[PDB]
């Protein structure tokens, strides 16, 4: 049975997937929810195949924005398998269709971003791995239309927009920490995307715009009153500085950005980068 508060949200789901299955999504028995999602993955696969689709992708994304928040790990896994099953049969051949899919999925990525900072490693690691796979676009396991020439969802740039978007709402400590946890893994996983100088083949603000957008975000919470939000924000910035010692003009920009404020952590941060600069003999 569907609780009264969810009647309007569930109605489009029912229209597409039928009352029986949607009811199971709300079951109190996690086995029933897990089984419902296993069935949903097949329902969605079969419906999308039938379109050699809009209603189906929309209702599936809507379901997934709910169940990807499920606190039961085995249900979350089933939810993520449904997400993959949808993506590989989804038709996306035009920038218009890309924009539409990006918006429908944004609430789903939001739920996953939160769980990147779940206390439990297997849940955070699966969440991080999922969004890293999304970053790989049409060469990853979440490629759009993988099972049937798709233009894909937008890879890293799309995930970056999700990380950096809707900041006035997705700003509690765990929503920030999950974003920061993913940011730290992005810089580690795809260094060439953020540190162009490592590919051996124009101004700093332009060439490094992607990195600078993530360090700007990090700087907004280096003073956060949650210990791990604050620590990871600072540690991200210090690691980036270490990475750009081979390119002093970039290092200079990071030091410059720490003049936007005289608060203590900026001062501390600035003295830390001065120290790295001396250690490595780039103090000009």
UniProtKB/Swiss-Prot annotation:
It is linked to 46,XY sex reversal 6: A disorder of sex development. Affected individuals have a 46,XY karyotype but present as phenotypically normal females. Belongs to the protein kinase superfamily. STE Ser/Thr protein kinase family. MAP kinase kinase kinase subfamily. Component of a protein kinase signal transduction cascade. Activates the ERK and JNK kinase pathways by phosphorylation of MAP2K1 and MAP2K4. May phosphorylate the MAPK8/JNK1 kinase. Activates CHUK and IKBKB, the central protein kinases of the NF-kappa-B pathway. Signal peptide: none annotated. The chain holds residues 548 to 867 of 1512 of the full protein. This is Mitogen-activated protein kinase kinase kinase 1. It comes from the Eukaryota. It comes from Homo sapiens (Human). Binds both upstream activators and downstream substrates in multimolecular complexes through its N-terminus. Oligomerizes after binding MAP2K4 or TRAF2. Interacts with AXIN1. Interacts (via the kinase catalytic domain) with STK38. Interacts with GRIPAP1. Coiled coil: none annotated. Autophosphorylated.
């Amino acid at each position: 049975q569907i609780p009264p508060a969810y009647k309007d949200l569930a109605e489009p789901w029912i229209q597409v997937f039928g009352m029986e299955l949607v009811g199971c999504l709300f079951s109190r028995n996690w086995n029933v929810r897990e089984m419902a999602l296993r069935r949903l993955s097949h329902d969605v696969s079969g419906a999308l195949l039938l379109a050699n689709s809009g209603d189906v992708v929309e209702a599936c994304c809507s379901v997934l924005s709910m169940v990807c928040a499920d606190p039961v790990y085995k249900v979350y896994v089933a939810a993520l398998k449904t997400l993959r099953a949808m993506l590989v049969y989804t038709p996306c051949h035009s920038l218009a269709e890309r924009i539409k899919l990006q918006r429908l999925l944004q609430p789903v990525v939001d739920t996953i971003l939160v769980k990147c900072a779940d206390a439990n490693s297997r849940t955070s690691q699966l969440s991080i791995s999922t969004l890293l796979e999304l970053c790989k676009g049409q060469a990853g396991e979440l490629a759009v239309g993988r099972e049937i020439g798709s233009i894909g969802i937008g890879g890293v740039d799309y995930v970056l927009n999700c990380i950096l978007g809707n900041q006035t709402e997705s700003n509690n400590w765990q929503e920030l920490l999950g974003r920061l946890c993913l940011i730290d893994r992005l810089l580690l996983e795809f260094p060439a995307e953020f540190y162009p100088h490592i590919v051996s083949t124009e101004p700093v603000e332009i060439r490094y715009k992607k990195l600078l957008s993530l360090l700007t975000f990090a700087l907004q919470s280096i003073d956060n009153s949650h210990s791990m939000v604050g620590k990871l924000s600072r540690r991200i910035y210090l690691s980036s500085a270490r990475m750009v010692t081979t390119v002093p003009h970039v290092f200079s920009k990071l030091l410059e950005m720490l003049s936007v404020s005289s608060s203590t952590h900026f001062t501390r941060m600035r003295r830390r980068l001065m120290a790295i600069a001396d250690e490595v003999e780039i103090a000009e």
